[PDB]
Design a binder for this molecule. Structure first.
Ligand SMILES: OC[C@H]1O[C@@](CO)(O[C@H]2O[C@H](CO)[C@@H](O)[C@H](O)[C@H]2O)[C@@H](O)[C@@H]1O
Length: 122
């Protein structure tokens, strides 16, 4: 039920980067996407914020096989991901579209892996 790029962009399933690398890249090369995401994030309660960080860290901790199985799970069942009951767009910056995915993954490796400052906005 998944395609190569939907629901999760191919480049995102293949990248060696952390979430924080992709976010730092977005801040520079996809700033509108970054700012839309952080605006959404900052409006969520702390428990939801924490859950999104934990879940995206889990996602990028997997290899391609794990990421692809997640994509398949969410392609076959739109309600697979429990976080979506609280925040459907918890991973919008990462998974929304392949153009953003290509731009961010083209440069994410140039950024530091663990820079948590990307989670602080205003
Ligand atoms: O497709 C609905 C399903 O997708 C999830 C996967 O975690 O949401 C992420 O992926 C979507 C599809 O690419 C993005 O549009 C969305 O912004 C992102 O959070 C789940 O939350 C949801 O159950």
């Amino acid at each position: 039920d998944a395609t190569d790029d939907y629901p999760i962009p191919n480049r995102i399933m293949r990248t060696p980067c952390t979430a924080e690398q992709i976010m730092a890249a977005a801040r520079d090369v996809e700033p509108v996407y970054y700012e839309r995401y952080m605006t959404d994030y900052k409006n969520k309660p702390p428990h939801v914020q924490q859950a999104a960080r934990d879940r995206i860290h889990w996602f990028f901790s997997m290899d391609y096989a794990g990421r692809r199985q997640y994509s398949e799970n969410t392609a076959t069942d739109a309600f697979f991901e429990q976080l979506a009951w609280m925040w459907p767009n918890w991973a919008k910056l990462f998974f929304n579209n392949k153009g953003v995915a290509a731009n961010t993954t083209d440069v994410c490796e140039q950024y530091p892996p663990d820079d948590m400052s990307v989670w602080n906005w205003d």
